[PDB]
Amino acid sequence: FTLIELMIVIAIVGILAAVALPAYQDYTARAQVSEAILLAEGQKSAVTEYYLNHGKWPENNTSAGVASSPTDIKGKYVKEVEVKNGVVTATMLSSGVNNEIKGKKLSLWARRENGSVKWFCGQPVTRTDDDTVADAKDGKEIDTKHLPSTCRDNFDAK
Amino acid sequence: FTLIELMIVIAIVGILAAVALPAYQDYTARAQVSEAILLAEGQKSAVTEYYLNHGKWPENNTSAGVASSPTDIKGKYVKEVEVKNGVVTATMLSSGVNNEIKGKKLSLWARRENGSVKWFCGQPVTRTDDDTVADAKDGKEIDTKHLPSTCRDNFDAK
Amino acid sequence: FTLIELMIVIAIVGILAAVALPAYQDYTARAQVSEAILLAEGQKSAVTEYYLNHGKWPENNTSAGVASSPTDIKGKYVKEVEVKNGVVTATMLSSGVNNEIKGKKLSLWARRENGSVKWFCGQPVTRTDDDTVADAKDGKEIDTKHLPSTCRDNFDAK
Amino acid sequence: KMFADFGSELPGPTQMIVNFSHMAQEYFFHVAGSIVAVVMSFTWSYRQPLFMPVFGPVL
Amino acid sequence: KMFADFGSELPGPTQMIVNFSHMAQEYFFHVAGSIVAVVMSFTWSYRQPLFMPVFGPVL
Numbered sequence: 206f207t208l209i210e211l212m213i214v215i216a217i218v219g220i221l222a223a224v225a226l227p228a229y230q231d232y233t234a235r236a237q238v239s240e241a242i243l244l245a246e247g248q249k250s251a252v253t254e255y256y257l258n259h260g261k262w263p264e265n266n267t268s269a270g271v272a273s274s275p276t277d278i279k280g281k282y283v284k285e286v287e288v289k290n291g292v293v294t295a296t297m298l299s300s301g302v303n304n305e306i307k308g309k310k311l312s313l314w315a316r317r318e319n320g321s322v323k324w325f326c327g328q329p330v331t332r333t334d335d336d337t338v339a340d341a342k343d344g345k346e347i348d349t350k351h352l353p354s355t356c357r358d359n360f361d362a363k
Numbered sequence: 364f365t366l367i368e369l370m371i372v373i374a375i376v377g378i379l380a381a382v383a384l385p386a387y388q389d390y391t392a393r394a395q396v397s398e399a400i401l402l403a404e405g406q407k408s409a410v411t412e413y414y415l416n417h418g419k420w421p422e423n424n425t426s427a428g429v430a431s432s433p434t435d436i437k438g439k440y441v442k443e444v445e446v447k448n449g450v451v452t453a454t455m456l457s458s459g460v461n462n463e464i465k466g467k468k469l470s471l472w473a474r475r476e477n478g479s480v481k482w483f484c485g486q487p488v489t490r491t492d493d494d495t496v497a498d499a500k501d502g503k504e505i506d507t508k509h510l511p512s513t514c515r516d517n518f519d520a521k
Numbered sequence: 522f523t524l525i526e527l528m529i530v531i532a533i534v535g536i537l538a539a540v541a542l543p544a545y546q547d548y549t550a551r552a553q554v555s556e557a558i559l560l561a562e563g564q565k566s567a568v569t570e571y572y573l574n575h576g577k578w579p580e581n582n583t584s585a586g587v588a589s590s591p592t593d594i595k596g597k598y599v600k601e602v603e604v605k606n607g608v609v610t611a612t613m614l615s616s617g618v619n620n621e622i623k624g625k626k627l628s629l630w631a632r633r634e635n636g637s638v639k640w641f642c643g644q645p646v647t648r649t650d651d652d653t654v655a656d657a658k659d660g661k662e663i664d665t666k667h668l669p670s671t672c673r674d675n676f677d678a679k
Numbered sequence: 680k681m682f683a684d685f686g687s688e689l690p691g692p693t694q695m696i697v698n699f700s701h702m703a704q705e706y707f708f709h710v711a712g713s714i715v716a717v718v719m720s721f722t723w724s725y726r727q728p729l730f731m732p733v734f735g736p737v738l
Numbered sequence: 739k740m741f742a743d744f745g746s747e748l749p750g751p752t753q754m755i756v757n758f759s760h761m762a763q764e765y766f767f768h769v770a771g772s773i774v775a776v777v778m779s780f781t782w783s784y785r786q787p788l789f790m791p792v793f794g795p796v797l
Binding site for chain 5: 220223224228229
């Protein structure tokens with residue numbers, strides 16, 4: 206006979222949350238990845254200096270002169286950050302993150318410019334030789350959709 | 364009869380993005396220019412030394428002792444950086460930038476202080492004589508709105 | 522009935538700017554002071570040499586062998602730099618600076634180590650005798666909060 | 680509400696990008712014409728279950 | 739159709755970049771819920787304008 210204004214408006218806010226759910230869920234993940242990136246960076250300094258001073262990429266965190274323990278460079282969504290031959294990889298925690306990005310990671314690596322180096326940011330990579338890395342293809346890479354426009358670099362970016 | 368909470372809140376986030384569009388679009392451009400500036404600088408060193416050691420401004424990159432190729436001093440938003448008689452100009456790429464700043468550029472030039480020099484940063488300029496430059500008036504200058512407060516220098520700044 | 526997502530998010534960015542306002546305003550001032558310090562230094566050379574070669578502190582800029590005119594040692598935020606009996610004071614311009622630091626200044630002074638001298642950096646000081654200075658107490662000193670950790674020296678620092 | 684939800688830029692609307700409070704206040708016209716519609720059909724449902732002598736209630 | 743035309747990324751839609759045929763087939767849900775709505779209002783408009791003797795229509 207009457208009461209449909211309360212029933213529809215409670216059910217439009219319910220469906221509004223369902224539509225606002227995936228937007229906040231990638232905005233959210235995309236936000237948790239933007240930090241793995243900040244934790245990865247700022248460690249470029251150590252790695253850059255080590256390379257320019259010696260001409261060899263730092264083998265591990267200790268070589269680069271950073272928390273000798275990967276797990277000591279963690280965060281809220283970051284379970285750690287390891288330096289492996291100049292390549293700095295950031296791992297996403299398992300608690301406090303999206304759902305399709307946890308335990309997932311990215312990498313920052315550089316290239317000899319000769320007198321200086323240039324840095325790249327993208328999906329996990331392994332270093333082959335002092336001037337070549339390759340996709341750490343394995344299945345734990347953070348999905349392209351969660352990576353900034355500034356971190357879409359490919360293993361062979363120059 | 365009911366469902367307007369879902370319809371309005373999906374349409375307020377839509378218009379919120381439209382209002383947040385121009386803010387992120389100049390904040391963004393203003394960010395891509397701040398780098399053209401960083402790429403232009405750090406090349407002041409070469410140019411300064413060349414001038415103080417010889418009393419003549421470096422004619423080109425090679426003279427200044429930098430990547431003999433302008434295109435070798437590029438970046439993400441920077442298509443290059445050329446040294447033309449001590450004046451260092453930075454060009455904005457065509458891909459990955461705002462829209463009203465691509466292919467656009469700025470300049471850094473210096474002036475003899477006698478025993479040292481002082482640097483300026485602003486819209487493109489050409490060098491006339493060893494102590495005078497002028498607006499490279501041509502239409503490809505990065506718009507004042509995109510330039511930092513520290514890079515508003517005029518051709519005749521002293 | 523609906524549109525509050527656009528209204529709140531435009532009003533959270535508004536209040537975000539108000540919270541980011543004082544942070545950028547002391548980071549900013551603290552940045553404009555860090556230069557008054559760089560302009561003050563590099564003039565230590567002249568002053569040091571003058572003292573070691575003669576055993577008397579340079580009375581003024583000309584004595585120290587620097588731009589005979591204080592105003593000739595100015596900058597963007599620096600209105601000048603004067604050498605007064607070995608003490609080098611830097612004045613903050615009136616245009617282009619914070620708001621509570623303009624027309625304000627700091628000093629660099631040294632002390633005979635016997636065979637060499639040691640430099641100090643802090644709030645304005647006056648020289649009394651060849652080995653003693655004192656607070657140029659007058660009200661135009663740059664506030665402690667704007668001074669680096671490396672420039673917190675007191676008139677009687679040894 | 681159905682004809683007024685058939686898109687944007689109808690007769691009397693606003694564009695969706697206004698601030699919500701202003702959009703809702705301008706439509707106040709239509710929110711009002713709906714309430715009046717309600718009051719009327721309520722009145723018909725509540726009620727419903729010069730020649731001076733011509734004006735008197737007769738038998 | 740007009741709530742489902744308020745922008746993109748509603749409940750149950752697709753993104754516009756799919757191929758048209760797939761977009762239209764996924765919405766088939768909603769095309770169906772509309773036709774059923776039609777059939778119903780048509781039914782209401784069409785309809786709406788052993789003791790053997792017990793079964794005969796009387797007066």
